[PDB]
Write a protein that binds this ligand. Sequence first.
Ligand code: I7P
Length: 164
Amino acid sequence: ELHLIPPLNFSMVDNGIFRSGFPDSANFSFLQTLGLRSIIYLCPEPYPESNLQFLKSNGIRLFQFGIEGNKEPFNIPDHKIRMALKVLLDEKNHPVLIHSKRGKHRTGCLVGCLRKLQKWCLTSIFDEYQRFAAAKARVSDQRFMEIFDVSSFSHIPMSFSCSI
Ligand SMILES: O=P(O)(O)O[C@H]1[C@@H](OP(=O)(O)O)[C@H](OP(=O)(O)O)[C@@H](OP(=O)(O)OP(=O)(O)O)[C@H](OP(=O)(O)O)[C@H]1OP(=O)(O)O
């Protein structure tokens, strides 16, 4: 009866936007229910054959922006986050799942930058980031969001969003 398994740290971010860690075959029946158009994948590692067959069967486009893992206190790639954000803000790509390995750091930073574009105060952005990152919350991830300059994205409409 209970049989659907969302991927690790799965959540709905907004209308047409999801976040998680790395899906495996146990999660495919759940992800099929979302009717995804796109995945934004933030790790450099090649997509496993299992996941590639799932994308092909379901007509899902893979956007890969490979952000190299780093541990505190040693550099979040502004350019890769911004390339991912440009794809995320295009409603033609929705519904879209953002994922990394566990969906805490790279995924957390991309979602936090979306919230800054949505005009959330920093403490509200950090609270949501911390909910997922839990004991692995990094000051460096929040600093990245704190200094992220919204200028180049500020004209992009979000009529997709629940938040008008
Ligand atoms: O605290 P560290 O510096 O030891 O981080 C560990 C690991 O934490 P753990 O050691 O408690 O298991 C992280 O997992 P969590 O903090 O998300 O639970 C993991 O991030 P991740 O989940 O892949 O990243 P997202 O998908 O969230 O972006 C990270 O991978 P990378 O930074 O991409 O290299 C690892 O670094 P290393 O062991 O050198 O490969």
